């Protein structure tokens, strides 16, 4: 029950502005992730922010193109992606987990107990 959005296909090069929002989540500090899955891969972890600290960390992949801003309301995050390339074709998850430390932002699937559907992303060229 994640709202995602802002997928869809682009030319590569172009960029995207995925979104997350977590309704109950102006409470609490939380960490919110994206992870991606291509058609026969893993799910790897793309880049996550700690609200507890103000964090944001990011693979090594997607460093300097992908960037995650805060909204004004607090349980709302984007990911801005530019400069696309074919391989960050894929479906793009957003995860979400309540945060009682605030202390890491967790980089694997199980450590996050929201999800949503995804939201597909095609780069062509």
């Known amino acids: 029950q994640l709202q995602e959005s802002g997928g869809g296909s682009v030319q590569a090069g172009g960029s995207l502005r995925l979104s997350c929002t977590a309704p109950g989540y102006t409470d609490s500090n939380y960490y919110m992730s994206w992870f991606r899955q291509a058609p026969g891969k893993e799910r790897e972890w793309v880049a996550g922010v700690n609200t507890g600290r103000g964090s944001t960390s990011y693979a090594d992949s997607v460093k300097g193109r992908f960037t995650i801003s805060q909204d004004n309301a607090k349980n709302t995050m984007f990911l801005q992606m530019n400069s696309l390339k074919p391989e960050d074709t894929a479906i793009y998850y957003c995860?979400?987990?309540?945060?009682?430390?605030?202390?890491?932002?967790?980089?694997?699937?199980?450590?996050?107990?929201?999800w949503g559907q995804g939201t597909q992303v095609t780069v062509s060229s």
């Open positions: 995860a979400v987990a309540a945060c009682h430390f605030c202390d890491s932002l967790p980089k694997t699937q199980d450590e996050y107990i929201l």
